[PDB]
Amino acid sequence: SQIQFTRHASDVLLNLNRLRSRDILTDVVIVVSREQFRAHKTVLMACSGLFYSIFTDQLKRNLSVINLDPEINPEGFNILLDFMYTSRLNLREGNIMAVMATAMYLQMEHVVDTCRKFIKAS
Amino acid sequence: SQIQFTRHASDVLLNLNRLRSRDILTDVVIVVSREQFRAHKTVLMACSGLFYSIFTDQLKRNLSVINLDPEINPEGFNILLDFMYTSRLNLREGNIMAVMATAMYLQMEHVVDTCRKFIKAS
Ligand SMILES: O=C(Cn1ccc2c(=O)[nH]c(N3CCC(Cc4ccccc4)CC3)nc21)Nc1ccncc1Cl
Ligand SMILES: O=C(Cn1ccc2c(=O)[nH]c(N3CCC(Cc4ccccc4)CC3)nc21)Nc1ccncc1Cl
């Protein structure tokens, strides 16, 4: 009973990543050792179980700075952060493990599973 | 060189609409005559030329209340607001005009064009 716009969701995600590229309405900085990454809490909740659980919590929802455990690999987080904003996963042999272990910490179950299927295909 | 996750963008949009259904991280109320609608500015910028232009403007970006012209049809705005959050357009013969004229006011060019193709198919 309703017309489906099959590329609207990808169009929207492209525009959210535009806004993040320009720092418009970003509302948190993620400290990953020496790196910082600004983002929209909503987009992070929408992609990670770690961030969903942190920010649904009234006690932590209005945080503007999140410090990840300094054991997180910054490249792995950047590749996953970009995945969140583009729906594209840069998996190389060269960083599969770092990405997997970072996607587990971030409670990104489907991405972790894709990494398991990635291993097999090696 | 990158694995494409073909439903990630739709999954994300579903979660943003969950958050809107629960009022998590909503940051504006849209007054349309007697109706109010809470939403995420980012999602509205990502879908409407009116809201993009209002909120990219540093002078208006931190508005928490937008009052639309009381000539806007509230049903038409609700159908378009829901489209923004689901990628589904409820076009009926019964409200095509109201939706079209509301999508023009909101600078939603593709939706307006779909309404023109909708007319033809009548
Ligand atoms: O789904 C995401 C974000 N995302 C994406 C993948 C993924 C993942 O693999 N795991 C989780 N978890 C957090 C909540 C989970 C189940 C749950 C659902 C509802 C209430 C309690 C628990 C378990 C772990 N989140 C994930 N966000 C989201 C979820 C629900 N409603 C709105 C949004 Cl925005
Ligand atoms: O595209 C949307 C939101 N959206 C969705 C459809 C649609 C539409 O049909 N028209 C406009 N207009 C606003 C800006 C337009 C061109 C422009 C682009 C860049 C700079 C100046 C002008 C003309 C009218 N927006 C639209 N948002 C968005 C756009 C760009 N970057 C980030 C985001 Cl979030």
* Calpha distance B58→A68 (Å, rounded): 31
User: Would the CB atoms of A5 and B56 count as touching at under 8 Å?
Assistant: no
- CA dist., res. B51 & res. A15, Å (int): 13
Find, among A44, A119, A4, the residue nearest to B10 by Cα.
Answer: A4
Beta A3-4 vs B28-32: how paired, if at all? unpaired
- Which amino acid type is present at position A74? P
How far is the C-alpha of B74 from the C-alpha of B23, rounded, in Å? Answer: 20
Tokens of B57: 């403007």
Q: How far is CA B53 from CA A15, A46, B40, in A?
A: 13, 25, 15
Would you say B108 and B47 are in contact if contact means Cβ atoms under 8 Å apart? yes
- The packing angle between helices A109-120 and A96-105, to 10°, is 150
Testing ligand 1's pocket by substitution, the residue of B15, B20, B21, B25 carrying the most ligand atoms inside 8 A of its CB is B15
CA distances from B76 to A64, B16, B40, B54, B90 (A): 36, 21, 19, 20, 10
Q: Determined by which method?
A: X-ray
The structure tokens 């060269």 sit at A94
Which 8-state DSSP code applies to residue B13? Answer: H
Q: Which amino acid is at B17?
A: N
Residue B81: both structure tokens together = 């607001």
* DSSP states of chain A: --EE-TTHHHHHHHHHHHHHHTTSS--EEEEETTEEEEE-HHHHHTT-HHHHHHHHSTTTTT-SEEEPPTTS-HHHHHHHHHHHHHSEE---GGGHHHHHHHHHHTT-HHHHHHHHHHHHT-
To the nearest whole Å, the CA of B69 is away from the closest chain A CA by 25
Measured over the CA atoms of residue A53, residue A59, residue A63 and residue A68, the dihedral's sign is negative
Q: Smallest CA–CA separation between B47 and chain A, in Å?
A: 7
Angstrom distance (rounded) from CA A22 to CA A16: 10
Query: B31 by DSSP, 3-state: which?
Result: strand
Question: Nearest CB to B25: which of A41, A88, A91?
Answer: A41
Q: Does the beta carbon of A114 sit less than 6 angstroms from any atom of ligand 1? A: no
Q: Answer yes or no: do B13 and A12 touch at CB < 8 A.
A: yes
Give the domain ranges of chain B: 1-122
Which residues fall within 8 angstroms of residue B92, CB to CB, at 6 or more apart?
Answer: none
Q: What is the resolution of this structure in A?
A: 2.2
Q: Chain B: nearest CA to A61, how far in angstroms?
A: 8
State the virtual CA torsion across A63, B65, B17, B115 in degrees, nearest 10. -150
Q: Is B88 in contact with A6 (Cβ distance < 8 A)? A: no
A48 alpha carbon to ligand 1 midpoint, in Å?
Answer: 7
Give A42 Cα–ligand 1 centroid separation in angstroms: 12
Q: Taking Cα atoms as reference points, which of B43, B34, B53, B38 lies closest to residue B106?
A: B53
Q: Are B31 and B65 in contact (CB under 8 A)?
A: yes
Query: B26 by DSSP, 3-state: which?
Result: coil
